[PDB]
Every structure is written in C-alpha cells, then in structure tokens.
C-alpha cells in the first residue's frame, strides 16, 4: 500500500513533469478532440501544404542551411529540433527525480544517453492518433499517410512510432501515469557502461514500486496494467535500437541529412 513517502515521490515526479514538458497528454487530447476550439491545427498532408507551413517557418529554416534541401530533409530537420527541445526538457525532468542528481555525472550522462529516446517515443504517443501527429507546439498536424508517402528511407522513420503509439494509447494512461513511466525509463539499471549499478537499481526499484501502486489505484480494473507497461518498456528499447540503426543508415547514405550536435553525441556509440 501507498505510504506518505511514496505519495510524495509520485507527487514531485508528476510536478516535475508538468513543469518541464510544454506539451502533455491533457493539452494534446484537447487539441486532437477539438472540443475546446473550432480552430483546428493546420494539416500538413501533401507537398503543397508542407510548403505552405514552411512559409511560416521561413526565418528559422533560413537560419540554418535548410530552406533549399529536399522536403524529406526539411521535415526531419524540424523533427530533430523538436527532439533537441525534448532532450533538454527531459534533462531538467531527470535532475528533479530524487536521487538522480546524486549520481556520478558519468552515470547521469549514460542514463540520459540511452533513456531519452525511449522517453521521447513514449511521450510522442500523447500527440499522435491513427491519422497523424501534432507538430509545432500543437499548431500543426502532419498526417501519417504523408509521412509514409515520402521516399525511402525517410518514409520508414515514423511509421513504427505510430504503430507503438496506437497500442500504447489503448492503455488510456494519463499524465500522472506517464510521468512515473518516463521516470522509470530514465532510472534504468540496465544501461551499457553504468558504474554504480547497485545504487541505480535501488533507485529504479523505488520508482517502479510507486508506478505499480499508483497504477493499481488509478486504473483498478486494469489488473495487469503494470505488467503491460513493463512489456512496453522492453518494446521501447527495441524500438529505439532499430531507430538508431536507421539513423546510422541515413547518416551514411544521405549526404544532406546532418545531425544536430546534441543528437549526434546521443547516437554516437549508442547500440
């Protein structure tokens, strides 16, 4: 059962999550359901609407050397910028997890290096439905079919994330569940190269324990929701392993698809 120290751990993880992530599930579902506004996001569903959307982003695109690259390269330059922002928010989120900042700096780097994209793809589900995903802070909606329509290999990047997201979203998690889930992802004792594995495993056990009790209380009828989420954690590691492999393939065969430096150091020597 859930004692006071455990409720407090769950509360500060939930608060750290609401503070650090501009987009979260309650905000995304309000946009995607369109029940708070008859002004829906601009839909990007083909090359013409992409180019319309990019007339808005012109100064940013011209900021880098991106405005004249292939559409596939422009799209995933913007997706990278989003990833960079989320890594920055996840780093702040992690430092607020009790015990994370006490770790050796090397272990903090390792946890984030291997954790952020598992967390990214888990939280990405919040802004996805079967037909597309919210972009540009919820102001745009880029369709699944348009992403599938791009040329190889750029058309293979997102579809597995949609596939994960549809099954993940069927669990009906709310932000309080997701914050603990993401905290469990980050505080993973398995990561290659970790030094103080005993102490991280200890930290993970407490978070995963709170996750389990929180789920049993918040979703009492879904008896095996915790086992289901354990499996989703395994699925995310495999999702991320394959994503890293695709990023490596693109980095070798695509002269024009540069990697942001922060993501470059995340992917370097990953899997």
């Amino acid at each position: 059962h859930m004692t006071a120290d455990l409720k407090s751990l769950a509360k500060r993880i939930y608060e750290a999550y609401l503070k650090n992530f501009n987009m979260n599930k309650v905000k995304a579902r309000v946009i995607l359901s369109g029940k708070a506004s008859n002004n829906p996001p601009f839909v990007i569903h083909d090359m013409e609407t992409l180019c319309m959307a990019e007339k808005t982003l012109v100064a940013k695109l011209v900021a880098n050397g991106i405005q004249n690259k292939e559409a596939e390269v422009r799209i995933f330059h913007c997706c990278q910028c989003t990833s960079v922002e989320t890594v920055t928010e996840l780093t702040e989120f992690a430092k607020a997890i009790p015990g994370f900042a006490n770790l050796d700096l090397n272990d903090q780097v390792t946890l984030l290096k291997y954790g952020v994209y598992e967390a990214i793809f888990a939280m990405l589900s919040s802004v996805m439905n079967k037909d597309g995903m919210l972009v540009a802070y919820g102001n745009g909606f880029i369709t699944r079919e348009f992403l599938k329509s791009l040329r190889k290999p750029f058309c293979d990047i997102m579809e597995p994330k949609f596939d994960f997201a549809m099954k993940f979203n069927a669990l009906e998690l709310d932000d309080s569940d997701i914050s603990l889930f993401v905290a469990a992802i980050i505080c993973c004792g398995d990561r290659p190269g970790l030094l103080n594995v005993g102490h991280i495993e200890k930290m993970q056990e407490g978070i995963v324990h709170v996750l389990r009790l929180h789920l049993q209380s918040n979703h009492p009828d879904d008896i095996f929701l915790f086992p289901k989420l354990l499996q989703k954690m395994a699925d995310l590691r495999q999702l991320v392993t394959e994503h890293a492999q695709l990023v490596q393939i693109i980095k070798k065969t695509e002269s024009d698809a540069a990697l942001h430096p922060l993501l470059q150091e995340i992917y370097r020597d990953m899997y």
Partner: peptide
Amino acid sequence: LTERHKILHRLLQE
C-alpha cells in the same frame, strides 16, 4: 564519457 557528451554534460551541470 563526459568528453564524448559535451552538450549533455553542460545541460546536466547548468
């Protein structure tokens, strides 16, 4: 391992 992750390391200390 921190030489190989300069930006991450900077955000963590920040």
